[PDB]
Amino acid sequence: STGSATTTPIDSLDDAYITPVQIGTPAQTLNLDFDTGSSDLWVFSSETTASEVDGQTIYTPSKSTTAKLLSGATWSISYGDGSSSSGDVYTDTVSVGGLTVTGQAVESAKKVSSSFTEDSTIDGLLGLAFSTLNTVSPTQQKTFFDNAKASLDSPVFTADLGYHAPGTYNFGFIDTTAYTGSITYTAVSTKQGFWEWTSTGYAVGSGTFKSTSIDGIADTGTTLLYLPATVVSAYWAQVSGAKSSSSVGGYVFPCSATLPSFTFGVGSARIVIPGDYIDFGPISTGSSSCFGGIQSSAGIGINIFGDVALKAAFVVFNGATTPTLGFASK
């Protein structure tokens, strides 16, 4: 089997991408944030505290003839941005782009933190990291991809995120028309539950490539590119007037600037992020200070190849017995 679904930016900045997901019978379609940095499929629901729902579409398990309470199971998750959610668990039929999994754990939120409530465009998350990170207790549950894997034509999914445009998540096949050149594959460590890999270096603009190992994760659920402070300083030093602002929470730059590209290495291959992908717009409406799309990871504990990086590539998440990541230009 295969599946193919379009993913759409939630706003004009590409802050996140939503993908329609069919849950239950008859289908209830919710727009979920596919997140290769986490491993829970959770949804706003008829159980979510009413004051914490503000425009999201909810899953109502009592209206699904295939929903079953997973008795005794609870979940609770906290994300790297400080947001969180928790609740109980149903199993139900879940379909993405024509690919159907029966018995998928659908984690129904009883509580969500304010950042979820305040974002009416995201109805939940669909985790695509390794199932070892799934938070359901006392019986950990498998991700949608893990459940689908055995049925797929090939045990892979691909992320093809658009810049200011829709893109595609495919399951079970690699669309050879969706990229240019060849795909370069690189080793993955699953020791932390992430799609963790080592970039071979970077360049700023037309500058020389610096060969240096940068361990990080491929994370579709993170907007920006978070890299070591040395690398980030080297980038922003090429933008007149750019500076790190403690009050704003990162590097800002004059909105009048033209940003240089940023290149990262994948083995001997190179992925170029155009400068325009690094512009996240005014820090507040009408400001002439703009927020940068490359930020320091120093306070995180891990480097994160988020959407800024991934949308410059066609990315293969190869879930074979020994997982690997592939990157191609497009």
Curated annotation (Swiss-Prot):
Species of provenance: Cryphonectria parasitica (Chestnut blight fungus)
Reactions catalysed according to its record: Hydrolysis of proteins with specificity similar to that of pepsin A, prefers hydrophobic residues at P1 and P1', but does not cleave 14-Ala-|-Leu-15 in the B chain of insulin or Z-Glu-Tyr. Clots milk
EC number: 3.4.23.22
Residues of the full protein shown: 90 to 419 of 419
Molecular function GO terms recorded: aspartic-type endopeptidase activity
Record's protein name: Endothiapepsin
Record bears the keyword Hydrolase: yes
Active-site annotation: D35, S199
Disulfide bond residue pairs: C255-C290
Record's keyword terms, sorted: Aspartyl protease, Disulfide bond, Hydrolase, Protease, Signal, Zymogen
Family according to the record: Belongs to the peptidase A1 family.
